[PDB]
Scaffold this active site. Structure first.
Site, PDB file in Angstrom:
ATOM      1  CE  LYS A  84      63.178-124.713 -56.648  1.00  0.00           C
ATOM      2  NZ  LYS A  84      63.016-124.667 -55.287  1.00  0.00           N
ATOM      3  CE1 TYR A  85      56.147-124.861 -60.896  1.00  0.00           C
ATOM      4  CE2 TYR A  85      56.406-122.803 -58.716  1.00  0.00           C
ATOM      5  CZ  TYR A  85      55.610-123.165 -60.485  1.00  0.00           C
ATOM      6  OH  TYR A  85      54.759-122.799 -60.809  1.00  0.00           O
ATOM      7  CB  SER A  86      60.641-121.844 -56.729  1.00  0.00           C
ATOM      8  OG  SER A  86      62.138-122.135 -55.671  1.00  0.00           O
ATOM      9  CE  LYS A 129      66.628-122.812 -53.501  1.00  0.00           C
ATOM     10  NZ  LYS A 129      66.361-123.510 -52.241  1.00  0.00           N
TER      11      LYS A 129
END
Lengths: 56, 480, 122, 388, 490
Positions: free
Chosen positions: E1-3, E130
């Site tokens: 996951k990045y954001s 998120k």
DNA sequence: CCCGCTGCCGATTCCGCTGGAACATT
DNA sequence: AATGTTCCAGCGGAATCGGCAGCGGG
């Protein structure tokens, strides 16, 4: 503080012998000497150049 | 519903954590816009028009006070979009609220950073300068410093994201076009800006083109060339270069996906083919093919401008050959034979054969000075085809109703350029323009205009050649 | 669990819900067997991709309500996280199970139920 | 043709007179200088492949003097000489005015407009810098941080310790240069002092974790000092090394413990043949020492040489557009022909033998490449181009 | 996951003994937890300054939460760490801090139960971001909270399972009854002590992971492979200094602009050329001319054959090594054959020499893909990842020329004495832990310039050697080494 | 000739990294 | 007078994502 390079170039007919099948050694010498001189003139150094010609 | 949602909008400004309240205000703005657009009564339309714009409290003053709000963007963007909707929803009586809108537009542009709001803060202002093109109620918009700032906002770092820059070029051109009265002096700078930037876009072995910027530059240059003509005789450098750029913007690519540079380039060509006089006789053949291509493109707005550019192109080259048609024998023959190619070829198109006929009619006049007989060699096969097509065969059931006005303009055109009338087809001539009348309601707009052009054209042609056949204009009007 | 096209996973979920209802009405010993399989397939949905989780749970529960009792918690944790039609699916999922959730008022209020009845969608 | 990391004469490029001329000239220049002269001889192909025409003309960098301090007593005066660092163009492309060609006839500016309703200009002296810290900004300004900044205690080459087990692996060098410390002048006892240090550090696997600052202004950097390994000098090379914030941890899924990418032994031997076809090293002349085919550590930078020739052409010939890149440049930057000739076949063996090069949906087209009846029957009976 | 931002809810107990000194004259555990949270914010707001943090106290007379359950006071909701939040949390330190918490919230109550965890759930639920990770730090000493009630214990157990369903991981940091550990207790199911790791050694870092490139490596002319080019070593450095107004304290948006073609006015990108004046002659080019003359190749690597990992010596490097890795995006099957020739380059001890070109119009530069095997254990230590390692090769003038005129031999007797010196000087180098002096001091200064605590902390210059310590470890022998061959002797 | 979704496709933003040009100590 | 740090601009993964066209619908 400064260095002096004194190049010599043979230009003679044997030096400029017609293409034996690849390319002329005289024009290779021309290409290399042009590399040397362009780098020297674009380095803005006080490394002088003296050019002589033989086989003239 | 009325003026209470705006009141709640200004009330929810000072609430702490204006994030959910931001969404509530945005929803209220959406509802207000939906209600105003849904309104159909002009009286209540003007009522809510005065209702929304109020100095004491309103969305205008909301934007003027919500300037220092990072999160109030989507609500500000929604308000700007609603303003863009409204500026054409209602008539031309924005005047008492116009200038402030323009001012606030600049404000909502000159402070807001997001390009999602910088676009509406240019859409609304382009709309404002288009719908107040009249000098009245418009000199309140100082074109001077407006041009100054929107031209100084592109002398800086490569910052603005090629869409706001597209609208900026469009607006610079529109300023050149609407109100050309104060900027008599700085249009040279705008022309040089357009040509230089268009150059960088079309000449570089780097950086795949900013196509939106190219489209904006071309349409703005088109608008600026209105009221600031450079005809192709006074300065024979800038017109060469503008036409070269138009060529390159309409040169036929083997495979391109987006059609936005060809649309604006074609609209420029359509508007200003007369501007490029001597440049428009060199590669005319390739222009002909590319214009037919984009007429056959099956797009929605690319054909609408390709056809206009083709029409204006043929019009200009007809008006050109009709001056010195000595070395134009070959070009004349080429054009007319390619019209024969379009018209004799078996094609299932509709607007295709309606090009050859109109070009036939335009190029008729230049034929009177090469033969003086082909005005009669034509106009007979033309009437004979008219008689075969839409007097006897499939007169009732077919699709050949679209291509009658083209026949009628072509007939009238060759008619004016023809002395000593054959005078045996004139009954069919009047019987043809009467039946152009008969079928006017089963047409569409923008050919109803052209069909009216055909009808007045036939009238003004046959009526200018002595009373003998002007006696038949009475008969045709009567029969219509 | 084929999340690339709508009809494959949505209709697999809907037919699975039909099968589950059928093997419940027929008092046979097979319902729990893949009721656990479909439960697990939803469990891989819960925490890596939420929209497909709620789509598939709505599709199973259109005909098989008694598979959201073990998912109500999840849907509430997701209920204030959706704005489009996913929130509609969430609330239909909760609706299939309401007649027996012990209070359901506190969970709804905690999730801004009063403020979401006030939106515009019919 | 121009330069190919290989042969010089095509088939037979020598004659008797040429051979004897080479003999006499090499003998004379050897007797004049010595074996170094025979070491210094090249062709017109590798002199275009190397900087050999540029020798003993440029000067040494700087004998940057400092001291190896172990503890507070073991002191060794040293002069570090700067070693490998990226070179760069020494001239700036100066902005001028168009069509009048004068440098002074332009001047930029910088105006700090406020976020107000217009460009509500403010002056330079009433702006102080901030810094990001959370959701707001910190009025740090200038003099304040020039007072409460870290202080460097001058230039320092003080040793932070040593280590046998090399956790200092090449994938952690973090530098922008390499330093190489030899000795000093002036009664070189520190020479043999640090020589003892590095002859202790070399034979056994220890390294030297060191602290280094260029000067008082410069920041301090902790690095590793691998011992020099050569015959004509014995140095202690130094290299910077990460701080706790520099190095990052990135979880990458394993490959040996991967199933759906399992390679078959057929593929393994195919790329085995591929590697051995394009190996750039071999052994010859019965010396049991490897040669260096395509030695990418001696050839020049094509960047500034191509810039040199481009500017030459545009300087003599103000009209012509940009030239093309020379053929000899493209020969510089291509492997020797032998490896390619030995290569084509296993290349295709992989091309077929491996899964497909499936996805290709990208384009990077430049601007210049995207915008620059009886009568008719009587006639038929009379005339016909074809027949029958 | 990045954001994806990880998050912490702090659930600090304040009921009866975590509040009270409890015969210990060192630090009350309520204050200890407050110190702990202070340290967390300091660490994050400058190392991970994008996450969501929240502090909630339970078992208190007052009660602030979204649903109005008793005894639960949500001090802060999940939001980015700020200086203001840590200042607001600062005012509950010491005896005066305990009394300030009393006069605002107040210890001692029928401390509620699972409802408390309930609030945590909602604090996670009612956010619109998120969340990669979600966890609740639970600072408490009360570790057997149900010696009297059995219904509330069961409700807490159900709600804790209810929370671990939705990805919420309880991990309770551990206050003490005697000050240290004696409470060996049984909430092992509720959870998935050592707070010193979470108080000091998170001083400054940064968080990310990104590709830096998505390039093609081409083998012959058409068998191209989809590689990404990450960097594992960066040289992070001090953030950008935004410009503020002296009075209003706003970030003025500067604008640069060129003018004065001898008429003032305003110049425009195409109104200017670029030039260089070498010797006595000017040379003039267009912007695009300069931008183009440094063009050799499209981005991506071109394979130039393989070379042993004994010819590329180690004294040649030029840039921080990169790290390539196959992503199956540009062309599919890349990982398969990429691993294939990685295994081959391992077993053959060979490396893929190439000609790197990272970006669109950039001069080429020779690189070598040194193969790299991974590392792991039962503890799952991802010390190294598997792939190649783009070492940048110097060209010809990167290599500078040293004088080389140094030849003095040595005495191979004292060499062993120096060996012994360095054998007593040795210790484990590291795998981590060399905090940057300048950067750490900068972060201290920003803290104690927006926290107002007038004394700025003093960064311990770990890098500085303890010269006295290793001198007293050395002994009095190096003086003999000095006198051995170079006595002062005038 | 119209109307509705349903991809996928350009641009936008916001980090991030590098290159290039500036800029202050010896 | 060289070198390291500060500063500025330009390119890029990555995420949104709005919407550009394009296949269904009446």
């Amino acid at each position: 503080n400064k260095a002096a390079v004194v190049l010599c170039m043979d230009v003679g007919f044997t030096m400029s012998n017609s293409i034996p099948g690849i390319e002329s050694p005289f024009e290779q010498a021309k290409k290399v000497i042009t590399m040397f001189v362009q780098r020297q003139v674009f380095a803005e150094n006080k490394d002088e150049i003296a050019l002589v010609l033989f086989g003239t | 519903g009325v003026r209470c949602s705006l009141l709640r909008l200004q009330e929810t400004l000072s609430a702490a954590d204006r994030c959910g309240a931001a969404l509530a205000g945005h929803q209220l703005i959406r509802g207000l816009g939906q209600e105003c657009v849904l309104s159909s009564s002009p009286a209540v339309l003007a009522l809510q028009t005065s209702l929304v714009f109020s100095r004491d409290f309103g969305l205008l003053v909301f934007v003027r006070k919500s300037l220092n709000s990072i999160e109030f963007r989507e609500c500000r963007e929604e308000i700007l979009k609603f303003l863009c909707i409204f500026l054409e929803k209602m008539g031309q009586k924005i005047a008492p609220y116009s200038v402030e809108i323009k001012n606030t537009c600049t404000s909502v542009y000159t402070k807001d950073r997001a390009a999602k709001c910088k676009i509406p803060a240019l859409d609304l202002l382009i709309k404002l300068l288009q719908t107040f093109r009249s000098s009245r109620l418009m000199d309140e918009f100082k074109i001077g410093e407006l041009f100054s700032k929107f031209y100084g906002e592109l002398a800086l770092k490569k910052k603005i994201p090629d869409t706001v820059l597209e609208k900026v070029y469009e607006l610079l051109g529109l300023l050149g076009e609407v109100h050309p009265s104060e900027m008599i002096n700085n249009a040279e700078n705008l022309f040089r800006a357009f040509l230089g930037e268009l150059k960088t876009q079309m000449t570089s072995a780097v950086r795949e083109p900013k196509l939106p910027v190219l489209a904006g530059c071309l349409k703005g240059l088109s608008s600026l060339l209105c009221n600031f003509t450079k005809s192709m005789e006074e300065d024979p450098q800038t017109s060469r270069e503008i036409f070269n750029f138009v060529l390159k913007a309409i040169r036929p690519q083997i495979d391109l996906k987006r059609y936005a540079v060809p649309s604006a380039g074609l609209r420029l060509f359509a508007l200003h083919a007369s501007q490029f006089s001597t440049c428009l006789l060199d590669n005319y053949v390739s222009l002909f093919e590319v214009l037919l291509k984009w007429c056959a493109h099956t797009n929605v707005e690319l054909k609408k401008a390709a056809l206009s550019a083709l029409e204006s192109f043929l019009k200009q080259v007809s008006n050109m050959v009709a001056k010195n048609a000595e070395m134009h024998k070959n070009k004349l023959q080429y054009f007319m034979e390619q019209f024969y190619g379009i018209i004799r070829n078996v094609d299932s198109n509709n607007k295709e054969l309606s090009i050859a006929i109109r070009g036939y009619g335009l190029f008729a006049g230049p034929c009177k000075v090469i033969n003086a007989k082909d005005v009669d060699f034509m106009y007979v096969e033309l009437i004979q085809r008219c008689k075969q097509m839409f007097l006897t065969q499939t007169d009732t059931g077919d699709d050949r109703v679209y291509q009658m006005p083209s026949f009628l303009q072509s007939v009238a055109s060759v008619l004016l350029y023809l002395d000593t009338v054959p005078e045996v087809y004139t009954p069919v001539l009047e019987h043809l323009v009467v039946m152009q009348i008969d079928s006017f309601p089963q047409y569409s707009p923008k050919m109803q205009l052209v069909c009216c052009r055909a009808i007045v054209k036939v009238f003004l042609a046959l009526a200018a050649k002595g009373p003998v056949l002007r006696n038949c204009i009475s008969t045709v009007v009567h029969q219509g | 669990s084929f999340v690339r096209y709508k009809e494959v996973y949505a209709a697999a979920a809907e037919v699975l819900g039909l099968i589950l209802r059928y093997v419940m009405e027929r008092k046979n010993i097979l319902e729990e067997s893949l009721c656990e399989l479909v439960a697990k397939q939803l469990k891989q949905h819960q925490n890596t991709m939420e929209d497909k989780f709620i789509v598939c749970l709505n599709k199973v529960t259109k005909s098989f309500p008694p598979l959201a009792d073990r998912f109500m918690n999840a849907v509430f944790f997701l209920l204030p996280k959706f704005h489009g039609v996913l929130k509609t699916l969430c609330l239909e999922v909760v609706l299939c199970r309401v007649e027996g959730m012990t209070e359901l008022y506190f969970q709804l209020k905690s999730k801004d139920f009063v403020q979401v009845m006030r939106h515009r969608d019919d | 043709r121009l330069g190919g990391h290989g042969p010089s004469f095509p088939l037979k490029g020598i004659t008797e007179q040429q051979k004897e001329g080479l003999e006499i000239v090499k003998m004379v220049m050897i007797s004049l200088e010595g074996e170094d002269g025979l070491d210094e001889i090249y062709s017109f192909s590798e002199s275009l492949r190397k900087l050999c025409v540029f020798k003993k003309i440029e000067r040494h960098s700087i004998h940057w003097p400092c001291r190896l301090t172990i503890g507070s007593n073991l002191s060794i005066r040293i002069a570090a000489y700067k070693s490998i660092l990226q070179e760069r163009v020494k001239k700036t492309w100066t902005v001028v005015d168009a069509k009048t060609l004068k440098k002074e006839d332009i001047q930029k500016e910088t105006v700090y407009c406020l976020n107000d309703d217009d460009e509500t200009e403010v002056l330079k002296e009433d702006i102080i810098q901030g810094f990001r810290y959370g959701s707001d900004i910190v009025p740090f300004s200038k003099v304040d941080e020039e007072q409460m900044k870290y202080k460097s205690e001058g230039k320092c080459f003080s040793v932070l310790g040593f280590c046998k087990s090399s956790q200092v692996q090449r994938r952690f060098f973090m530098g922008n240069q390499v330093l190489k410390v030899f000795a000093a002048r002036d009664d070189e006892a520190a020479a043999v002092a640090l020589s003892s240090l590095i002859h202790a550090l070399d034979d056994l696997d220890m390294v030297a974790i060191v602290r280094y600052a260029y000067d008082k202004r410069a920041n301090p950097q902790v690095g590793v000092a691998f011992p020099h390994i050569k015959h004509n000098y014995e140095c202690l090379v130094y290299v910077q090394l990460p701080f706790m914030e520099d190095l990052r941890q990135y979880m990458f899924s394993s490959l040996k413990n991967s199933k759906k990418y399992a390679p078959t032994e057929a593929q393994l031997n195919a790329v085995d043949a591929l590697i051995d076809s394009m190996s750039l090293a071999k052994k010859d002349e019965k010396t049991d020492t490897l040669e260096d085919l395509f030695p990418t550590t001696k050839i020049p930078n094509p960047r500034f040489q191509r810039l040199f020739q481009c500017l030459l052409h545009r300087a003599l010939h103000p009209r012509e557009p940009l030239p093309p890149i020379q053929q000899h440049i493209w020969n510089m930057l291509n492997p020797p022909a032998e490896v390619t000739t030995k290569s084509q076949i296993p290349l295709s063996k992989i091309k077929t033998l491996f899964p497909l090069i499936e996805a290709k949906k990208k384009d990077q087209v430049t601007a210049q490449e995207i915008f620059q009846a009886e009568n008719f029957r009587v006639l038929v009976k009379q005339k016909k181009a074809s027949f029958e | 996951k990045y954001s994806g931002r990880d998050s912490l809810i702090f659930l600090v107990d304040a009921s009866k003994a975590m509040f009270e000194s409890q015969s210990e004259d060192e630090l009350t555990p309520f204050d200890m937890s407050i110190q702990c949270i202070q340290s967390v914010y300091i660490s994050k707001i400058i190392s991970s300054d994008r996450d969501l943090l929240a502090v909630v106290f339970y078992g208190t007379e007052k009660d602030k939460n979204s649903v109005n359950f008793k005894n639960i006071y949500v001090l802060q909701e999940l939001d980015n760490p700020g200086a203001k939040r840590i200042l607001e949390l600062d005012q509950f330190k010491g005896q005066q801090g305990q009394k300030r918490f009393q006069d605002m919230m107040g210890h001692g109550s029928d401390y509620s139960l699972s409802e408390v965890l309930w609030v945590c759930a909602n604090l996670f639920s009612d956010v619109q971001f998120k969340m990669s990770h979600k966890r609740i730090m639970l600072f408490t000493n009360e570790d057997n909270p149900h010696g009297n009630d059995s219904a509330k214990a069961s409700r807490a157990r159900t709600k804790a399972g209810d929370l671990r369903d939705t990805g919420i991981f309880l991990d309770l940091m551990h206050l003490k009854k005697p000050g240290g550990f004696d409470i060996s207790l049984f909430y092992r199911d509720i959870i998935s002590s050592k707070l010193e790791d979470l108080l000091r050694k998170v001083r400054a870092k940064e968080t990310r992971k990104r590709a830096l490139s998505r390039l093609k490596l081409k083998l012959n002319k058409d068998i191209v492979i989809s590689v990404g080019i990450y960097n594992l070593v960066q040289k992070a450095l001090k953030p950008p200094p935004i410009k503020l107004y002296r009075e209003t304290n706003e970030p003025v948006k500067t604008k640069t602009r060129t003018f004065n073609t001898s008429t003032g006015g305003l110049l425009l990108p195409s109104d200017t050329k670029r030039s260089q004046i070498y010797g006595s002659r000017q040379i003039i080019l267009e912007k695009e001319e300069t931008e183009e003359l440094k063009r050799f190749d499209d981005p991506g690597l071109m394979l130039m054959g393989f070379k042993p990992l004994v010819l590329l010596k180690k004294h040649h490097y030029l840039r921080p090594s990169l790290f390539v890795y196959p992503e199956e995006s540009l062309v599919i099957g890349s990982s398969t054959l990429f691993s294939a020739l990685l295994i081959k380059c391992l077993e053959k001890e060979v490396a893929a020499l190439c000609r790197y070109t990272p970006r669109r119009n950039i001069p080429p530069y020779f690189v070598a893909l040194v193969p790299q095997e991974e590392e792991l254990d039962d503890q799952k230590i991802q010390v190294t990842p598997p792939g190649f390692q783009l070492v940048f090769l110097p060209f010809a003038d990167d290599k500078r020329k040293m004088p080389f005129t140094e030849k003095i031999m040595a005495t191979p007797e004292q060499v062993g004495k120096m060996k012994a010196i360095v054998e007593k000087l040795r210790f484990t180098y590291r795998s981590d832990s060399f905090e940057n002096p300048v950067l750490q001091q900068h972060f201290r200064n920003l803290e104690a310039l927006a926290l107002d605590l007038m004394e700025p902390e003093q960064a311990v210059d770990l890098t500085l050697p303890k010269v006295e310590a290793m001198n007293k470890r050395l002994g009095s022998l190096v003086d003999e080494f000095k006198e051995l061959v170079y006595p002062p002797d005038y």
